[PDB]
Structures are given as C-alpha cells and as structure tokens.
Design a protein around this ligand. Structure first.
Ligand SMILES: Nc1ncnc2c1ncn2[C@@H]1O[C@H](COP(=O)(O)O)[C@@H](OP(=O)(O)O)[C@H]1O
Ligand SMILES: CC(C)NC[C@@H]1CCc2cc(CO)c([N+](=O)[O-])cc2N1
Length: 246
C-alpha cells in the first residue's frame, strides 16, 4: 500500500471532497489537512522540519523523501496543504502515481482562502480562528507550518501574504507550473463541479454506482464550526452539527 494519486491542488480548491472521492474509489485512506488537525497533530512538527530542510543551501533530498514516505505510510493518496507543495518530490518518489490538479475560479479561491486558511494579519476574524483552534488543541506552530508550506508552494522566501493581488498571481502561476511540468498523460485537471466522470476515466475505474460526488468543507461550514467551537468549547459536544465532515 503506497501512493497512487498525488493531489497537487492548492487548499480551498475542493481537496477535502477529492480526499473523500479517492477514499470511495480505493477504500483506503487519503491524506489531507484534516488528517493532521483532527487525527495526527504530531505531524505538524515533521512537516515543519521538511519545509525547513528545503530552505538550506544544500537540502538533503533523501531526508525529505524518507520523511514524506513515513508521513504517508498507509495512505493511497494525498491532497491539500502541506503535501501539495511537495508534489514534485512525490512524483519523483512514486513514478507511477498519477497527479491531480484541483482548480477553481481564482477570485472564489482567494475569498475562501482568506476565510479559513490565511486571513490578512489585521483581519479580526484571525482571532476567532485562533480561539476556535485553541479548542482543538492547535497552537501557533500550526500557522507557521501552513504559512511556510504556502510560501514553499509559491517558491517565495519573502512575500506579503496580506496582498490579494500577489496571492492571485501566485495562484495562477502555481497552477500554470503544475501543468507545465507534469506530463499531460499523467495529469488530470479537475474543475470544481466536474464530478466522477473525468476522474474515474483517469484512474481507470467505473463511476461509483448510486454514490454522488462529495461536496464538503465550505467556508460557511468552517465559519459555523469556528463559532460553535468558541461557544461550546468542545469538538465532541458539537461534532453532531457537522455530519460526514471530519
Ligand atoms: N462538489 C463540489 N462542488 C462545488 N464546490 C465544492 C465541491 N466540493 C468542495 N467544494 C468547495 O471547495 C472548497 C473547499 O476546498 P478544500 O477542501 O480544498 O478546502 C469550498 O469552497 P468555498 O469555501 O468557496 O465554499 C467548497 O465549498
Ligand atoms: C475552523 C477552525 C477551527 N480551523 C479549522 C480549519 C480546518 C480546515 C483547515 C484546512 C486548511 C487547509 O486545508 C487549513 N490551513 O492550511 O490553515 C486550516 C484549516 N483550519
């Protein structure tokens, strides 16, 4: 059991739905940020060490490959931040794995990103996210790892993450680059809304009979989850309000 599909799509492009879709297709687990937050928060420091390794004048690529392989043990696929930023290293490690690029309108993406993953530093919603994350046992190291992995995906050392215009152009550049460096036969570009057909064709499987394509992880749902975590101060107490999400 090793990686068959590498999800290179950025966060907030339908990765949790793609995660669920792949788990339906393969009946084996797919990695996602939800795996880290809700199941394995100890992975945060490991991802941080790997991203830190990339910032060295001479990076130890074998250390990174071995670290990626350990993180992804028991998974059939990976999606989302932070793994998407390592899609090149994953491609090298798993030469037979196919690559998915989940994609969507860039303006909707940015809006989604600011609501969940990367608020502007002066946005009051950032404090509500933090307070909510406190309930989940998430600390400040989490934000450093996600920030560093976005910067790593965009291949930038210095960047003003509060500038929407920069993030929009980074998004387009990122998706262009994936399309440039992944051979066409090894890549499926999956637009938000595309559903089973193109995906199943690509992965050489039939469309799941009587099972609809997943639709999960809206910023509306994430805003409500943040609100409810703050109100009740317990995930277990509110999880029934979020069926089928985690
Ligand atoms: N089947 C589907 N059709 C349309 N949008 C979908 C979808 N599945 C997920 N999404 C959207 O993809 C985004 C989440 O992606 P990710 O899981 O990578 O964080 C959300 O966007 P919004 O925040 O605009 O609602 C979510 O609503
Ligand atoms: C709602 C509040 C309690 N925070 C929890 C949410 C869960 C989904 C999520 C997903 C990503 C990337 O998919 C990131 N990210 O990269 O920062 C952060 C979060 N945070």
């Amino acid at each position: 059991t090793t990686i068959q599909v590498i999800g290179a799509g950025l966060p907030r492009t339908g990765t949790n739905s793609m995660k669920k879709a792949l788990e339906i297709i393969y009946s084996k687990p797919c990695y996602h940020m939800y795996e880290i937050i809700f199941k394995k928060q100890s992975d945060i420091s490991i991802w941080q060490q790997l991203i830190d390794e990339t910032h060295k004048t001479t990076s130890d690529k074998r250390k990174i490959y071995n670290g990626l392989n350990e993180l992804l043990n028991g998974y059939i696929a990976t999606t989302d931040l932070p793994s998407c930023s390592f899609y090149k290293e994953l491609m090298t490690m798993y030469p037979n794995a196919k690559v998915l690029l989940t994609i969507r309108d860039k303006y909707d993406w940015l809006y989604s990103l600011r609501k969940v993953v990367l608020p502007k530093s002066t946005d009051p919603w950032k404090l509500k996210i933090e307070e909510g994350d406190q309930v989940l046992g998430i600390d400040s190291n989490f934000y450093k790892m996600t920030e560093d992995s976005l910067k790593f995906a965009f291949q930038k050392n210095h960047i003003n993450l509060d500038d929407d215009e920069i993030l929009l152009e980074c998004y387009d550049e990122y998706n262009r680059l994936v399309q440039e460096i992944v051979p066409p036969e090894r890549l499926l570009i999956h637009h938000l809304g595309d559903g089973w057909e193109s995906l199943c064709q690509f992965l050489n499987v039939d469309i799941p009979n009587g099972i609809s394509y997943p639709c999960a992880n809206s910023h509306h749902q994430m805003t409500q989850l943040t609100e409810q975590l703050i109100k009740h101060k317990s995930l277990d107490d509110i999880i029934h309000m979020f069926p089928g999400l985690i």
